[PDB]
Design a protein around this nucleic acid. Structure first.
Ligand code: NA
Lengths: 133, 132
DNA sequence: CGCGTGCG
DNA sequence: CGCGAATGCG
């Protein structure tokens, strides 16, 4: 049931809350299409939410037909609701990750996109291609 | 275990939310010591909350040694916490019970009192004497 | 660590 | 109907 001609995102975390990075890779080859530099403090869910919206922006910029895959049931919901329901405090330490979540929410509120967001079923398909471990 | 020399309070409720009233009775004699005309819209829990605090002001004014009995676990805890955790919407129609509950909370925030608040154990001792 | 079913 | 407390993957 898996669509190989597609985009897979995943978040690497050094603690949660902790340092967060993410990347988007080709599901078939493994080529890294985009990647973002580690953020000092955020949650895993905030990272997945940014990773999805970033892949959405990358695919729309390119008029792609690739679905986007994520293994985070929570962040897919957040993206579809256009609202990231994170509990993380809002201080100077967390201001970068929150600025990026706010602008991603703003992009979802002002843009259409035809890329379907698909669940990656790990228990069935193995690690998502973009896994960091 | 039952302190017969005490006060019992209870809420009369037609619907919840709905019209709620309450009264304090002497546990032994049944004699009605205070009584609240029906409020148009309230919850039982808020009615109970008010009935306990009414008992406490009633009992403090007369320097009584009576405990207060209530069979509502929720409202007994709300009084101890000085906070009535009702989910009733605040609107014109519910302005009155919220006024009374806000004022009942403010009384608890500002007053000491010595009468203990005890759980009436309906399963072991039958009906609370203030039952409508 | 982060997230979404006794009685008055 | 209103209320209080617990108890699955990245
Ligand atoms: Na009662």
């Amino acid at each position: 049931e898996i669509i190989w001609e597609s985009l897979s995102v995943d978040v690497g975390s050094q603690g949660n809350p902790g340092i967060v990075e993410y990347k988007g890779v080709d599901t078939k080859t493994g080529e890294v299409l985009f990647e973002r530099e580690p953020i000092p403090i955020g949650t895993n869910n905030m990272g997945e939410f940014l990773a999805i919206v970033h892949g959405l922006r990358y695919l729309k910029e390119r008029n792609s037909r690739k679905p986007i895959y994520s293994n985070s049931q929570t962040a897919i919901k957040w993206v579809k609701d256009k609202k990231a329901k994170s509990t993380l405090v809002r201080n100077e330490e967390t201001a970068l990750i929150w600025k990026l979540v706010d602008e991603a929410e703003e992009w979802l509120n002002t843009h259409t996109y035809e890329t379907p967001i698909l669940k990656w079923q790990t228990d069935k398909w193995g690690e998502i291609k973009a896994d960091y471990g």
